[PDB]
A paper describes a structure:
The YFP mutants were named YFP-nG, where n is the number of the inserted amino acids (1, G; 3, GGG; 6, GGSGGT; 9, GGSGGTGGS; and 12, GGSGGTGGSGGT). To confirm that the glycine insertion produced a space near the chromophore, we determined the crystal structures of YFP-1G and YFP-3G at 1.3 Å and 1.5 Å resolution, respectively. In the YFP-3G structure (green), the four amino acid residues of β–strand 7 (146-149, GGYN) were not modeled due to poor electron density in this region, suggesting that these residues exhibit conformational flexibility. Because the four residues of YFP-3G were disordered, the cavity of YFP-3G would be partially exposed to the outside, which may change the arrangement of the water molecules. In addition, the main chromophore of YFP-3G is largely shifted. The most remarkable difference is that the side chain of Tyr145 (Tyr146 for YFP-G1 and Tyr148 for YFP-G3) moved away from the neighborhood of the chromophore, producing a large space near the chromophore. On the contrary, the absorbance spectrum of YFP-3G did not show the peak at 380 nm with low chloride ion concentration, but the peak appeared when the chloride ion concentration was increased. This chloride ion dependency is similar to that of E2GFP, suggesting that YFP-3G switches its chromophore structure to the open-conformation by binding of the chloride ion. The fluorescence intensity of YFP-3G was 6-fold lower than that of YFP, but it was still enough to be visually detected. The pressure sensitivity of YFP-3G was improved 5-fold at 300 MPa and over 13-fold at 100 MPa, compared with that of YFP. Fluorescent intensities of YFP-3G expressed in E. coli cells increased with the hydrostatic pressure while those of YFP slightly decreased.
Residue numbers in the entry: 1 to 64, 68 to 145, 150 to 233
Write the structure that this text describes.
């Protein structure tokens, strides 16, 4: 097993730091938790440290650690994420909210000692002040697939997927995701055959937490290659 892989055989502490600006509404979020890739398990708690989060927490779920996905033994040569560790990779995304604005994110995911860290910058523009996002019309508790393909030319991967956030009136707010990952190091990485990650997610609250926050539990499993 490679250095990349063996770095995830046990429980790994996680730290996330995000700075955002959506239509001029600036905010910061700190996250802590742990990942157990053996079980594709993520347990996290995010806290808005600047007061009230100006966007719905559900819209930040996908932004808030694919290196913790459980890759079946027979699919191990297709795990790009762990292969780039500990040096890490840069994840870039554009998330288009149908009939509203878009988020553009840049995240540097890598190890700092024994801690897996993700430093994120989020920029949102063209949002409607009273739309489903800035107007907070999305339900908090709104199995889904994330499609991965190799991008040989850029020595990384290209990822695409759609999320449908539940609107309070019963409708749905589509969030179309376009993602790219590129290694930070100059070392070797695994370029995968087409496959996907299956997500199970659940949002909750900490009963003793007064700050605006989100408790997020996820189970991520690679599939698509039999």
């Amino acid at each position: 097993v490679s250095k990349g892989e063996e770095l995830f055989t046990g429980v790994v502490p996680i730290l996330v730091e995000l700075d955002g600006d959506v239509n001029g509404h600036k905010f910061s979020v700190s996250g802590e938790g742990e990942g157990d890739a053996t079980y594709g398990k993520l347990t996290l708690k995010f806290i808005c440290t600047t007061g009230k989060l100006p966007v719905p927490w559900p819209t930040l779920v996908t932004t808030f650690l694919q290196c913790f996905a459980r890759y079946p033994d027979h699919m191990k040569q297709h795990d790009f994420f762990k292969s780039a560790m500990p040096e890490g990779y840069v994840q870039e995304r554009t998330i288009f909210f149908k009939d509203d604005g878009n988020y553009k994110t840049r995240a540097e995911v890598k190890f700092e000692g024994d801690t897996l860290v993700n430093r994120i910058e989020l920029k949102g523009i063209d949002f409607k002040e009273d739309g489903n996002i800035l107007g907070h019309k999305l339900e908090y508790n709104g199995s889904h697939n994330v499609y991965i393909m190799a991008d040989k030319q850029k020595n990384g991967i290209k990822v695409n997927f759609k999320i449908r956030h539940n609107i309070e009136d019963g409708s749905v707010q589509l969030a179309d995701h376009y993602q790219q990952n590129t290694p930070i190091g100059d070392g070797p990485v695994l370029l995968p055959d087409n496959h996907y990650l299956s997500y199970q997610s659940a949002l909750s609250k900490d009963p003793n937490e007064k700050r605006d926050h989100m408790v997020l539990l996820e189970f991520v499993t690679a599939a698509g290659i039999t």
